[PDB]
Design a protein around this ligand. Structure first.
Ligand SMILES: O=C1CCc2cc(-c3csc(COc4ccccc4)n3)ccc2N1
Ligand SMILES: O=C1CCc2cc(-c3csc(COc4ccccc4)n3)ccc2N1
Ligand SMILES: [Zn+2]
Ligand SMILES: [Zn+2]
Ligand SMILES: [Zn+2]
Ligand SMILES: [Zn+2]
Lengths: 227, 228
């Protein structure tokens, strides 16, 4: 809702691996309960890259302040898809002239919704946000038409965002179930020996979260072809 | 409120694993929104066991018919705590002579509250609702003094009910916040190898949710303890 959910938990920040933190923010979402949303902060040269923003400007600000107060200035943010649990902090970041990144199709979907756009876009299937350290990849449509993943080669850590859905597919409103099985299969061959997979809405796992997502996508596609 | 013609999403039933269904019902919590409630239906060869009832007689009846028309006998239900979102359809199940179960303490709380009780009580820290297949465990007070969890040793699924609160404890009006940290740690140390953990009010996860609940219990205790 437009209002502040006064009793949600606060923004969480936790170290996942050597260069890498998980940030978790929380929102009240109709029909689901409280929903957690994980993103990352990846440090490069002791400068911070946000992988997805929190739901809100308030938690984006808290996140940024925490790292900046500790000497880690913000090099940029990248959003894995257009929904506000990935993109909600883009306007705040833009107002601080922190570069924000999104695919061309993500920015088009933001605009079509009258959302503020990232100030840096990329067309096409791979994008090195930081060569050999932060890569973006488009597996095809799934949770949404634009969803991308972020790969950290040096840690073998995959940020699957809202594409990774081990225990169920979540909000299907913008989903492409026909395509999701093919996308999930593609993603699983490519990142099969990830050490760690970070879903948006489920806590971190190993590479079996790729197989679970594929099974859930196969499952939802089947059920949808009914009564 | 929602309008007079507004209905909340309809009861959902979803396969979770070979023997095992999640059932999700909804109520509106006036100005927080619409909030889901998960229970299970556990299948042991053509018998079905309800793990928690929906909030309402009407959804308890929908849930029972769904399985009766797929050929199952409803052998009984068990309620994980006394709140309506676990016991709301005991009165209806009783009216159809489906055995209903709760702990001795849960039935006492129901009777205290002027509510219909389950027809069968158990008491003790472990209780087999179905030997080798459906186990009930009391971790200690937390969400409520009487909350219990259900364990399916053969799927390694834990139904944690409203005890499992990985994103925030929820309403503490009936809770024992001083006990919840200890109870949570006992629950974690017993079921740390669960393949799945099913909370009442958030989605299915893995055994991580045990750790998250402990963290939330401890932090809730701390917050309630500051002098401001
Ligand atoms: O593999 C599967 C399919 C996905 C899935 C979902 C759940 C589950 C339990 S309550 C819940 C809440 O949902 C709804 C509440 C309101 C509107 C739409 C959905 N969702 C349990 C297990 C399964 N497991
Ligand atoms: O602004 C909004 C409200 C929040 C929101 C959520 C989603 C979305 C898509 S799949 C998904 C997964 O959810 C959950 C997964 C587990 C538990 C409860 C929810 N969640 C998409 C867009 C919106 N956008
Ligand atoms: Zn989304
Ligand atoms: Zn999402
Ligand atoms: Zn309760
Ligand atoms: Zn509850």
């Amino acid at each position: 809702g437009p209002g502040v959910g006064e009793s949600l938990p606060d923004l969480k920040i936790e170290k996942l691996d050597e260069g890498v933190y998980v940030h978790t923010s929380f929102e009240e979402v109709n029909g689901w309960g409280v929903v957690p949303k994980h993103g990352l902060v990846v440090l490069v040269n002791a400068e911070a890259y946000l992988i997805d923003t929190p739901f809100t400007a308030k938690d984006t600000e808290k996140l940024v302040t925490w790292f900046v107060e500790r000497g880690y200035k913000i090099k940029g943010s990248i959003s894995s898809h257009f929904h506000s649990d990935s993109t909600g902090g883009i306007e705040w970041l833009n107002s601080r002239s922190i570069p924000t990144y999104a695919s061309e199709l993500t920015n088009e979907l933001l605009k079509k919704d009258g959302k503020v756009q990232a100030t840096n876009s990329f067309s096409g299937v791979n994008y090195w946000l930081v060569k050999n350290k932060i890569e973006v990849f488009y597996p095809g449509p799934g949770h949404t038409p634009d969803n991308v993943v972020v790969w950290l080669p040096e840690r073998k850590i995959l940020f699957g965002g809202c594409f990774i859905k081990p225990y169920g597919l979540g909000n299907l409103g913008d989903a492409n179930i026909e395509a999701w099985p093919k996308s999930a299969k593609l993603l699983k061959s490519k990142y099969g020996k990830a050490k760690l997979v970070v879903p948006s809405h489920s806590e971190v796992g190993d590479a079996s979260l790729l197989k679970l997502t594929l099974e859930q996508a196969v499952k939802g596609l089947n059920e949808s072809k009914k009564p």
